[PDB]
Amino acid sequence: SVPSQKTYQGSYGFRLGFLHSGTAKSVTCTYSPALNKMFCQLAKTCPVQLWVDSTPPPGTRVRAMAIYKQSQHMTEVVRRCPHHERSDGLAPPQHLIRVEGNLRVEYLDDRNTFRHSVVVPYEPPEVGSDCTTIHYNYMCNSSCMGGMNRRPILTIITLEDSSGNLLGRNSFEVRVCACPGRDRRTEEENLR
Amino acid sequence: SVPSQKTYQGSYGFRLGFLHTAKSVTCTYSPALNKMFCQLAKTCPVQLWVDSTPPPGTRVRAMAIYKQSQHMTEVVRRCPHHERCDSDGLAPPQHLIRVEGNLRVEYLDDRNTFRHSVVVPYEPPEVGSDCTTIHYNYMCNSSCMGGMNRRPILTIITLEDSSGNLLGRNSFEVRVCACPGRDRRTEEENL
Amino acid sequence: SVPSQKTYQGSYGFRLGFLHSGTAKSVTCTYSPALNKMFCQLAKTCPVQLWVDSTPPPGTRVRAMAIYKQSQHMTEVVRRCPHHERCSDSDGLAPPQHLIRVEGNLRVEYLDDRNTFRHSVVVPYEPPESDCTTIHYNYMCNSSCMGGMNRRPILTIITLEDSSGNLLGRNSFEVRVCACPGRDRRTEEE
Amino acid sequence: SSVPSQKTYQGSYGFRLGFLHSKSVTCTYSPALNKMFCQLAKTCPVQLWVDSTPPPGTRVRAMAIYKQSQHMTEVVRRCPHHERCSDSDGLAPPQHLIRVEGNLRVEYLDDRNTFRHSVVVPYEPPEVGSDCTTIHYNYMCNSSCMGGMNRRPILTIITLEDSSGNLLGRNSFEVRVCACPGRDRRTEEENL
DNA sequence: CGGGCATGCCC
DNA sequence: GGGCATGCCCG
DNA sequence: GGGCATGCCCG
DNA sequence: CGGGCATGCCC
Ligand SMILES: *C[C@@H]1C(=O)C2CCN1CC2
Ligand SMILES: *C[C@@H]1C(=O)C2CCN1CC2
Ligand SMILES: *C[C@@H]1C(=O)C2CCN1CC2
Ligand SMILES: *C[C@@H]1C(=O)C2CCN1CC2
Ligand SMILES: *C[C@@H]1C(=O)C2CCN1CC2
Ligand SMILES: *C[C@@H]1C(=O)C2CCN1CC2
Ligand SMILES: *C[C@@H]1C(=O)C2CCN1CC2
Ligand SMILES: *C[C@H]1C(=O)C2CCN1CC2
Ligand SMILES: [Zn+2]
Ligand SMILES: [Zn+2]
Ligand SMILES: [Zn+2]
Ligand SMILES: [Zn+2]
């Protein structure tokens, strides 16, 4: 079954935050609140903030998974194109989404659905901060032929206990493109 | 190594011909550039013109190479995406160049140079015709990532005997694109 | 014995020309007239123009050779550093030890001189398509490489030769291979 | 190549390392980073402290590995320039990064199975009136050497072993070989 | 930092 | 055919 | 000890 | 694009 994308704050008040990087043409990543859509470049750092009202228990994990947004493509596993599949020392070459700068990263190929995901332990924010940040990398362009092939995707962020039970969920659309600033302005202008 | 490009009409007067830039054209040839513009997997007719007919057993080989000397040693092959596609029943999935409509087509993977080539027997022109046309197919765009990767290529057409000895050679540049008529006008106007 | 660097226009009025690309920090190759010095990045295209008053005969060749500019280093052969001489930058035609390559010419020829041990690269002269024939040189080590040039400045000598090697003309220019030619040209000119 | 263990192991003899007290200085050790900053080919003293005297024939082996997990499987060796510099003392083969000075009983190993380099000397008990044994190490490449360590930080693994090579103890410390150890220690400390 | 264009694709 | 979608070369 | 030389990084 | 850091080296 297609994994759920429904927003769910859960008993810890789980919410996502994003950096507000603007729409300069050269911007490596930028988030559009009006679209709830992240625009980023291939393999560049894509910060995602985790916000909670109450700290989840030790053993809590944070999983990221991509699915196709269009209903006719939702049952197809999101994976890297054959060119980019051919790197780093921790992530499987087939996985679209990586976590950088975290040696506790763990990747999953699902036994039943064959979907890819990446999971890290939830770590509480630093003494001064009010949120925890994960540095994601997207390893294919949305336009990659033989891969996403111009099909829009969503990234589903799930807060899990140690057993994998759901504690909270949030999602956002992603476009991996060469020009995130240009493309965000173009789509937001097309809301008019 | 690097195969020869030298035009060589040889003992039989071997030369190439091409049919005769709108944005609908499946293929278009530029005499000014000696360059064929064609779309992926669409008919690319090349005419064989000879002054004298070659003997029975003569073969016609086609091979692609990169035009730039910095890439000329790299084997031209299909990109990873299209390699994973669309066979006609005989063409191996990694070969860039195919021949359509010839049951006697042979595809060669050289055991030593690793270069790909496609070979058909030479047929004399039909009654009333003064040339023999072979319908080639290019199975990747010049821009295909992980393949030609926007590098221009040349197609080398060689006339060979059954033993592989050279009888004649010609060549032409080729760009496999989505809008051949458009790119031909741009290149001819950027000179 | 050090190869000659004496400018000689010869019977064909042989001069060099360079593209004027400014001093932006990311410029891949820029020429300073005040210094007669080329600032370029490693393995990037460095255009050198050949200007002649009359077309030299067929068979004419164009050779490029690097020598150290300082007199106390002039007898040392300019070569790549031990690190770079082990890469795979091949290009299919160039020797791994040679500092200077020509890109985009299948008729390129490289020489290790049997007597002087010096490296040079030669291409056939081809008439302009332009008022000038351009050769695309690549320099395969930074001026600062340890065990190679080691921050010593070099001169590139361009010689026009007939098919037998006789001198038809000669010109030269200083070269710095660096990460940021735009920044370094400004610093050296200041 | 498989990565040698870095696990601290005091062993039956309570083996531990010590360092002398610390911008013109040739070497300096930072307790906050467990990191040694030293100059190329300069004396880098390392103290051996034991609670009990190991048996005769015990040896002390030093081996370098890259600290980052990405480069951990790569053998640490001298850059091509320094390997050709012929700056040998007469004992160390030119490819070895780590040398021992002032000990003619030194032995250098090019492991036939792992291809790792190491340098080993006999363990000498502390002299009368002393509490530790000092080995004077030399590092023959800067951390920044192109074609060698190439700005990748390394760890030095010191092992105590018997005559046959069996492990008796292990410690480790990060090391940066640079031109100005005092400047670079101050810089790295001040970034924490 | 990115302007300008290459190149697939849709109307 | 006009124009958009979307990557990238070189400063 | 400043401070420059110079490869590199970062968007 | 430049700003500026990393880092060997010079006064
Ligand atoms: C949104 C709802 C809930 O509150 C839980 C988790 C997700 N769905 C179904 C049950
Ligand atoms: C949009 C992207 C960028 O960030 C710069 C300017 C245009 N493209 C390629 C490089
Ligand atoms: C969400 C948190 C904070 O409180 C500040 C700004 C972004 N992160 C890290 C520090
Ligand atoms: C040039 C090509 C074609 O053949 C049609 C019309 C314009 N483009 C895309 C489809
Ligand atoms: C040298 C010649 C010319 O006259 C211009 C500038 C560079 N080349 C080609 C065109
Ligand atoms: C000067 C060099 C370059 O060309 C760019 C900008 C600054 N450095 C590194 C990348
Ligand atoms: C840091 C190093 C030193 O040890 C002295 C002073 C500054 N540099 C070069 C010499
Ligand atoms: C081992 C220890 C001692 O006993 C003195 C000499 C060396 N080290 C510091 C002081
Ligand atoms: Zn891809
Ligand atoms: Zn393809
Ligand atoms: Zn070098
Ligand atoms: Zn070194």
Numbering used by the authors:
A (entry chain A): 96 to 181, 185 to 290
B (entry chain B): 96 to 115, 118 to 182, 184 to 289
C (entry chain C): 96 to 224, 227 to 287
D (entry chain D): 95 to 116, 120 to 289
Q: Can I see the authors' text?
A:
In addition, we present the structures of MQ bound to DNA complexes of the rescued double mutant R273C/S240R, referred as R273C/S240R-DNA-MQ, and two types of MQ-modified wt complexes referred as wt-DNA-MQ (I-III) and wt-DNA-MQ (P1). In each case, two decameric half-sites interact with two p53 dimers to form a p53-DNA tetramer. In addition, residual bulks of electron density close to the sulfur atom of C124 are observed in the other two structures, R273H-DNA-MQ and wt-DNA-MQ (P1), but too weak for unambiguous MQ modeling. Inter-dimer interactions by the S7/S8 loop do not exist in the wt-DNA (P1) complex and its MQ-modified structure, because the two p53 dimers are rotated relative to each other owing to the two base-pair spacer between the half-sites, resulting in different inter-dimer interactions. The single MQ-Lys conjugate (MQr-K101) observed in the current study has been identified in a single monomer (A) of this structure. The MQ-K101 conjugate is stabilized extensively through intra- and intermolecular interactions. The occurrence of this conjugate is surprising because the amino nitrogen is much less reactive than a thiol sulfur in the Michael Addition.
The human p53 tumor suppressor is a 393-residue protein that in response to cellular stress, acts as a transcription factor by binding as a tetramer to a wide range of DNA response elements, activating various events including DNA repair, cell-cycle arrest, senescence or apoptosis. Mutations in the p53 gene were observed in more than half of human cancers. To uncover the structural basis of rescuing p53 mutants by MQ we investigated by X-ray crystallography high-resolution structures of the core domains of mutant and wild-type p53 bound to MQ in the absence and/or the presence of their DNA response elements.
